[PDB]
């Protein structure tokens, strides 16, 4: 099938871990041998232990039992620990490779699927495949060693009784299943024909609204008498047919036992037979009934494990960034132009953007005005090349953006919004998310103080080196905004995108926020999602887009005089 | 608890079948004795069998085994059959009593609870209680006999080793459960502390948008390396605990075994001891572990059975038809009067009918016109006293309904509708639901002929003695109407009510239906649910009822001149 080539693919991963697997295999083999020898211990106990007057063997028995138990315990511990180590290291390397591939492949992938399932793909699926494969391997090795040792012990004690107890058992199972299936078919036919009396009872029970008028209580009661008799007779037949089953199976199994006993009477096997040899041979069959049951199901577990590994490898090599450009930008001038750009959301229809023509010179600022969607978020994403446009051109400093490297393009730009992702790290390291050692602490504190962030950071425990709580436990929305502003100031990025529609206007101390923002985009260009007026009236250019289509252009006064959708949004305060 | 009171209440029902229970008990005791004797058979086989040169016991062993197995099979068959007979007869009598009670119980329950689930408590509930009680009885009897036999056998063979085993087992169980409990607590604590590190990986997988912009893939990889080391170390600890769990239990169990062996080494017990005795005693423990596991769950089964019986009994006793009147009417004159009758549907609110005033003389006919509900169905139910009115008076021939018996009142009235309940019987007997012998076949055929029923009945197999198929397989809607008309014609009811709104007017050969209806209510009073015009224009009186109150009264011409709701319904063809 497809599983074994997958296992061949995993051998390069598990190869440097062969020592642990070998130790675990040896320990498991010794575990199985310990159990088999414990069963083999039964013969001396029943043979020379109690019947004879000697005491040495009976008093020596508990010590060797305890020794075998200590050996079994320590070998189980060693085997499980080494399998644990191999599984853990394989899980480490597979998760690490999967995540390293994950952090470089496009946004659309996790846009499509929920992040909870994406996490489960690495925290459960890898654990699932490791656990299933390790369980299948340990089952095969241990139960195979136990089966081989048990068969060897059985044959060495009495090969004649072993050959009698073999081949006889499969035909006994054949007869048992034949009888069981015949009786199951009989019961199925009985259940199929049982429905008519129930239907008749339901038909009678539904006629109250009609039987009540005509006084047919007596006749209907007689009808129920007959149908109840016919219901009980079929129940009798049902239960009798069901109950014939178990006596037949018991009788056939015990007749097999009687055949074994009768065959043991012949002098062919009685010569080498001893009172202890049968006690170990029959008990060995009793024990051996379980390993085959647990060994015939290994294929299901292994197939499940390899299916999980295949669905993981599907994610492992789906795709990655379309890195094609090879020119780096020291610092973008600031002029960006959209010409006839039309983009469609992958996996959907009804394209959001079409035929946009915009020019943003260096230093100037453009504010986008529109409805809830309005394609503004799509434009903000496309400026930083989260996605790739289908038709149209984006000219940055006179050249196409796609002929440039992704790293330089993303470094030249900054994104500021309330929904900025904090993380479990220190504020000093968080402000400079990358290039931490390329920026001094003095620069960090100066950037924080010019962003009006030192007001709360200083009056907060552990100073500037405090670790941010998980998903802003310690930090607040205004504090998140201040941290993002400080991050923007620290990295001198000419191109900025400023989202404000999702922000709440109920926060206090907004004067500091507006002052910091006013000091922010000096001598640099910023596209602002115009929702707050303070970024609206003083904006150099205001562009109106409805449903992802450009509609209006001009300054605030010109748009207000036009009395278009700009004024209508003015009455509603832009939503 | 309350279960035993219900069992004592049920005991008189089962009492007349004491022979079946006695035979089943004797058979089950013999079954358990057969099993324990088969177990006791081990001692001769392993003591005087293979070891000694004599072979008589070994060759006579298979016949003993076969005989014990034949005895077990036949006694299991007898016990199961007799328990089946007792259960079947108890179910028969209980269902019969419950059903006979139920058809004497008002239609209020029938409308409250669906008839599709009412049979679920005559076919499944009674079967459930009988099966559970019988299973509890056999589980007590057979398993108690088995454990008593096992204890007697063990104490008869070697009571020293028996008391050692029965003293050692409980403390072994105590230690095993203590170890399992503490290790389960450790495992749940490990899960509690594993959640907080599992949630850490998802904290960075959500940062794709933020990671991509600032080029923090290297720092992200380092963070994942750390949180992956922390993941695998905790997985190590988890699996190490889960692996140290089991060997402790195994070691304690086999140390108990070693203690048993070392104690049996002492000369105080070994002197009278032999190999067969230890074999049978240890096998007796092995076999006895199952009954006490299954004998301790009898209370749950008995509680379930008695709860089912409690529900069934609660259905068994409830309110029945209020039989307060004690006067029989030979034949009602026909005059019926409603005065200020207000009735509310039980279990609901918003009374359907209120302040209705109507006078219906003998021979005259009245047709009710209204909307879908309009309370017409309520009036049809109330005239025949399906329910009891709350406030108001109904005077039948100048006398109240409740003053007269329910049986005579329902005998006086006739109900005609499309939804007449056919049933599994012959058409000749169907025409007269009751008093079949009080009406001759000649009268039946004449009534069918004047009801235009011979048109299709004769051209249909087996003639007038045909049995109606299950839920009207043979009969059709028009045929159902014709047979209901014949049923009404055969028994000369002075008062009849017929419904027409639920009827379909698309049927063919309606001329015969209208002719039969015209010939039907000659010289007797009929109340027609006015939906078909042919019963509307020629109606002696027409009464309009809206939302349960009478609004218009008069002839068709007067109502049409009034141009009220009657005319508006006339344009819409009265629905």
Short mmCIF file of C-alpha atoms in Angstrom, two decimals, chain B residues 269-531:
data_model
loop_
_atom_site.label_atom_id
_atom_site.label_comp_id
_atom_site.label_asym_id
_atom_site.label_seq_id
_atom_site.Cartn_x
_atom_site.Cartn_y
_atom_site.Cartn_z
CA UNK B 269 -0.49 -27.18 55.63
CA UNK B 270 1.69 -29.16 53.19
CA UNK B 271 1.23 -32.44 55.09
CA UNK B 272 -2.36 -33.02 53.93
CA UNK B 273 -1.80 -31.12 50.68
CA UNK B 274 -1.29 -32.45 47.15
CA UNK B 275 -0.90 -31.03 43.65
CA UNK B 276 -4.52 -31.54 42.63
CA UNK B 277 -5.74 -29.64 45.68
CA UNK B 278 -3.71 -26.53 44.88
CA UNK B 279 -4.69 -26.76 41.22
CA UNK B 280 -8.41 -26.90 42.02
CA UNK B 281 -8.20 -24.17 44.68
CA UNK B 282 -6.33 -21.71 42.46
CA UNK B 283 -8.64 -22.50 39.54
CA UNK B 284 -11.52 -21.92 41.97
CA UNK B 285 -10.25 -18.40 42.68
CA UNK B 286 -9.87 -17.86 38.93
CA UNK B 287 -13.46 -18.98 38.31
CA UNK B 288 -14.89 -17.20 41.37
CA UNK B 289 -13.56 -13.77 40.37
CA UNK B 290 -16.32 -13.60 37.73
CA UNK B 291 -19.53 -14.27 39.76
CA UNK B 292 -18.77 -11.74 42.50
CA UNK B 293 -18.04 -9.28 39.69
CA UNK B 294 -21.44 -10.12 38.18
CA UNK B 295 -23.36 -10.79 41.42
CA UNK B 296 -22.73 -7.25 42.69
CA UNK B 297 -24.47 -5.59 39.72
CA UNK B 298 -27.85 -7.25 40.35
CA UNK B 299 -29.12 -4.20 42.25
CA UNK B 300 -28.72 -1.92 39.23
CA UNK B 301 -30.69 -4.29 36.99
CA UNK B 302 -33.42 -4.74 39.60
CA UNK B 303 -33.66 -0.97 40.13
CA UNK B 304 -34.01 -0.41 36.39
CA UNK B 305 -36.68 -3.09 36.12
CA UNK B 306 -38.66 -1.74 39.06
CA UNK B 307 -38.39 1.82 37.71
CA UNK B 308 -39.88 0.59 34.43
CA UNK B 309 -42.60 -1.19 36.41
CA UNK B 310 -43.24 2.00 38.39
CA UNK B 311 -43.76 3.99 35.19
CA UNK B 312 -45.99 1.24 33.81
CA UNK B 313 -48.06 1.17 37.00
CA UNK B 314 -48.37 4.96 36.96
CA UNK B 315 -49.90 4.58 33.52
CA UNK B 316 -52.05 1.73 34.88
CA UNK B 317 -53.92 3.89 37.41
CA UNK B 318 -55.22 7.32 36.38
CA UNK B 319 -58.48 9.15 35.74
CA UNK B 320 -61.09 7.29 33.68
CA UNK B 321 -64.37 8.18 32.00
CA UNK B 322 -66.64 10.03 34.43
CA UNK B 323 -69.68 7.73 34.59
CA UNK B 324 -72.12 9.72 36.74
CA UNK B 325 -75.41 9.42 34.86
CA UNK B 326 -77.53 6.32 35.26
CA UNK B 327 -80.35 6.74 32.71
CA UNK B 328 -80.63 4.95 29.36
CA UNK B 329 -82.16 6.57 26.27
CA UNK B 330 -83.99 4.32 23.81
CA UNK B 331 -83.83 6.94 21.04
CA UNK B 332 -83.13 10.67 21.23
CA UNK B 333 -85.78 12.93 19.70
CA UNK B 334 -83.18 15.09 17.96
CA UNK B 335 -83.42 18.50 19.63
CA UNK B 336 -80.07 19.67 21.04
CA UNK B 337 -79.35 23.07 22.59
CA UNK B 338 -76.12 24.86 23.48
CA UNK B 339 -76.45 27.70 26.01
CA UNK B 340 -73.46 29.80 27.12
CA UNK B 341 -71.07 26.86 26.75
CA UNK B 342 -67.44 27.78 27.46
CA UNK B 343 -64.81 25.05 27.23
CA UNK B 344 -61.03 25.14 27.60
CA UNK B 345 -58.58 22.62 26.16
CA UNK B 346 -56.92 20.80 29.09
CA UNK B 347 -53.22 21.47 29.49
CA UNK B 348 -53.45 24.74 27.54
CA UNK B 349 -54.96 28.23 27.76
CA UNK B 350 -56.86 30.64 25.47
CA UNK B 351 -60.28 28.91 25.73
CA UNK B 352 -61.38 27.64 22.32
CA UNK B 353 -65.13 28.10 22.87
CA UNK B 354 -67.12 30.64 24.85
CA UNK B 355 -70.75 31.87 24.96
CA UNK B 356 -72.26 29.76 22.18
CA UNK B 357 -76.05 29.73 21.81
CA UNK B 358 -77.64 27.26 19.38
CA UNK B 359 -80.92 25.36 19.03
CA UNK B 360 -81.08 22.35 16.71
CA UNK B 361 -84.59 20.87 16.40
CA UNK B 362 -85.32 17.31 15.35
CA UNK B 363 -85.17 16.78 11.58
CA UNK B 364 -83.62 20.16 10.85
CA UNK B 365 -80.01 20.52 9.73
CA UNK B 366 -77.34 23.09 10.60
CA UNK B 367 -74.10 23.85 8.76
CA UNK B 368 -71.16 25.53 10.48
CA UNK B 369 -69.04 27.97 8.46
CA UNK B 370 -65.73 29.39 9.61
CA UNK B 371 -61.95 29.45 9.35
CA UNK B 372 -59.55 26.51 9.74
CA UNK B 373 -59.98 25.94 13.46
CA UNK B 374 -63.14 27.94 14.20
CA UNK B 375 -63.91 25.59 17.09
CA UNK B 376 -66.00 23.40 14.78
CA UNK B 377 -63.96 20.32 15.68
CA UNK B 378 -64.40 21.22 19.35
CA UNK B 379 -68.18 21.39 18.89
CA UNK B 380 -68.17 18.03 17.10
CA UNK B 381 -66.19 16.50 19.96
CA UNK B 382 -68.39 18.09 22.63
CA UNK B 383 -71.79 17.11 21.20
CA UNK B 384 -70.83 13.45 21.61
CA UNK B 385 -69.06 14.22 24.93
CA UNK B 386 -65.49 13.32 24.07
CA UNK B 387 -64.62 16.01 26.63
CA UNK B 388 -66.53 17.70 29.45
CA UNK B 389 -67.49 21.36 29.22
CA UNK B 390 -66.28 23.73 31.93
CA UNK B 391 -69.09 26.31 31.95
CA UNK B 392 -72.36 26.34 30.03
CA UNK B 393 -75.16 23.89 29.41
CA UNK B 394 -75.90 21.31 26.72
CA UNK B 395 -79.53 20.18 26.72
CA UNK B 396 -80.20 17.03 24.68
CA UNK B 397 -83.98 16.77 24.22
CA UNK B 398 -84.28 19.23 27.09
CA UNK B 399 -81.97 17.26 29.41
CA UNK B 400 -78.30 17.59 30.31
CA UNK B 401 -75.65 15.26 28.92
CA UNK B 402 -74.03 14.44 32.26
CA UNK B 403 -77.38 13.25 33.66
CA UNK B 404 -77.33 10.41 31.09
CA UNK B 405 -74.92 7.50 30.74
CA UNK B 406 -71.93 7.78 28.43
CA UNK B 407 -72.67 4.47 26.67
CA UNK B 408 -76.23 5.35 25.67
CA UNK B 409 -75.18 8.88 24.69
CA UNK B 410 -72.47 7.58 22.37
CA UNK B 411 -74.90 4.98 21.02
CA UNK B 412 -77.36 7.73 20.07
CA UNK B 413 -74.86 9.76 18.02
CA UNK B 414 -73.16 8.99 14.72
CA UNK B 415 -69.82 10.35 13.49
CA UNK B 416 -69.03 10.54 9.77
CA UNK B 417 -65.77 11.77 8.23
CA UNK B 418 -63.11 10.89 5.69
CA UNK B 419 -60.70 9.95 8.48
CA UNK B 420 -62.83 7.04 9.69
CA UNK B 421 -60.74 4.32 11.32
CA UNK B 422 -60.74 1.08 9.35
CA UNK B 423 -59.18 -2.00 10.92
CA UNK B 424 -58.04 -5.59 10.37
CA UNK B 425 -61.39 -7.34 10.08
CA UNK B 426 -64.03 -8.27 7.52
CA UNK B 427 -66.13 -5.63 5.77
CA UNK B 428 -69.32 -7.43 6.82
CA UNK B 429 -68.23 -7.23 10.46
CA UNK B 430 -66.72 -3.78 9.88
CA UNK B 431 -70.11 -2.32 8.92
CA UNK B 432 -71.36 -3.18 12.43
CA UNK B 433 -68.38 -2.59 14.73
CA UNK B 434 -70.36 -4.05 17.64
CA UNK B 435 -73.68 -5.94 17.92
CA UNK B 436 -72.67 -8.03 14.91
CA UNK B 437 -75.09 -10.83 15.81
CA UNK B 438 -77.89 -8.32 16.44
CA UNK B 439 -77.96 -7.37 12.74
CA UNK B 440 -78.56 -9.88 9.95
CA UNK B 441 -76.48 -10.18 6.80
CA UNK B 442 -79.52 -9.22 4.72
CA UNK B 443 -79.78 -5.93 6.62
CA UNK B 444 -76.04 -5.38 6.12
CA UNK B 445 -76.20 -5.90 2.36
CA UNK B 446 -79.33 -3.76 2.02
CA UNK B 447 -77.65 -0.95 3.97
CA UNK B 448 -74.53 -1.23 1.81
CA UNK B 449 -76.66 -1.12 -1.35
CA UNK B 450 -78.54 1.99 -0.24
CA UNK B 451 -75.15 3.51 0.64
CA UNK B 452 -73.86 2.83 -2.90
CA UNK B 453 -71.24 0.42 -1.56
CA UNK B 454 -71.98 -2.59 -3.79
CA UNK B 455 -70.60 -0.70 -6.80
CA UNK B 456 -67.00 -1.44 -5.79
CA UNK B 457 -67.31 -4.14 -3.11
CA UNK B 458 -68.80 -6.74 -5.46
CA UNK B 459 -66.15 -5.93 -8.08
CA UNK B 460 -63.48 -6.83 -5.51
CA UNK B 461 -62.13 -10.17 -4.36
CA UNK B 462 -63.91 -12.40 -1.80
CA UNK B 463 -67.02 -10.19 -1.81
CA UNK B 464 -68.50 -8.82 1.41
CA UNK B 465 -66.32 -11.17 3.52
CA UNK B 466 -63.06 -9.52 2.44
CA UNK B 467 -60.69 -8.50 5.24
CA UNK B 468 -59.48 -4.91 5.13
CA UNK B 469 -55.74 -4.67 4.65
CA UNK B 470 -53.40 -3.22 7.25
CA UNK B 471 -54.23 0.50 7.55
CA UNK B 472 -56.60 0.40 4.58
CA UNK B 473 -54.36 -1.23 1.97
CA UNK B 474 -57.39 -2.26 -0.10
CA UNK B 475 -59.89 0.48 0.77
CA UNK B 476 -59.48 4.00 -0.61
CA UNK B 477 -60.61 7.42 0.58
CA UNK B 478 -63.86 7.39 -1.36
CA UNK B 479 -64.32 3.75 -0.42
CA UNK B 480 -63.63 4.68 3.21
CA UNK B 481 -66.31 7.36 3.00
CA UNK B 482 -68.77 4.90 1.45
CA UNK B 483 -68.16 2.25 4.10
CA UNK B 484 -68.54 4.85 6.85
CA UNK B 485 -71.83 5.96 5.29
CA UNK B 486 -72.99 2.34 5.25
CA UNK B 487 -71.97 2.00 8.90
CA UNK B 488 -74.03 5.07 9.78
CA UNK B 489 -76.99 3.79 7.75
CA UNK B 490 -77.04 0.35 9.36
CA UNK B 491 -77.50 1.75 12.89
CA UNK B 492 -80.37 4.26 12.77
CA UNK B 493 -78.87 7.03 14.88
CA UNK B 494 -81.29 9.97 15.34
CA UNK B 495 -78.39 12.45 15.60
CA UNK B 496 -75.44 12.51 13.21
CA UNK B 497 -72.48 14.84 12.73
CA UNK B 498 -70.36 14.79 9.57
CA UNK B 499 -67.13 16.60 8.70
CA UNK B 500 -66.22 17.79 5.21
CA UNK B 501 -63.30 20.26 5.54
CA UNK B 502 -60.67 17.51 5.73
CA UNK B 503 -62.18 15.80 2.68
CA UNK B 504 -60.65 16.13 -0.78
CA UNK B 505 -63.08 17.32 -3.46
CA UNK B 506 -60.93 16.09 -6.38
CA UNK B 507 -62.30 12.54 -6.17
CA UNK B 508 -64.31 11.17 -9.09
CA UNK B 509 -67.88 9.80 -9.04
CA UNK B 510 -68.93 12.31 -6.39
CA UNK B 511 -72.52 12.04 -7.67
CA UNK B 512 -72.98 8.74 -5.82
CA UNK B 513 -71.50 10.28 -2.66
CA UNK B 514 -73.89 13.24 -2.78
CA UNK B 515 -76.85 10.96 -3.51
CA UNK B 516 -75.99 8.75 -0.53
CA UNK B 517 -75.58 11.80 1.70
CA UNK B 518 -78.93 13.19 0.54
CA UNK B 519 -80.58 9.85 1.31
CA UNK B 520 -78.69 9.68 4.62
CA UNK B 521 -80.12 12.31 6.98
CA UNK B 522 -83.72 11.95 5.80
CA UNK B 523 -86.08 12.33 8.79
CA UNK B 524 -83.21 12.76 11.26
CA UNK B 525 -80.93 15.53 12.44
CA UNK B 526 -77.49 16.14 10.92
CA UNK B 527 -74.77 18.67 11.77
CA UNK B 528 -72.57 19.32 8.74
CA UNK B 529 -69.13 20.93 8.80
CA UNK B 530 -69.87 23.18 5.82
CA UNK B 531 -67.03 23.01 3.30
#
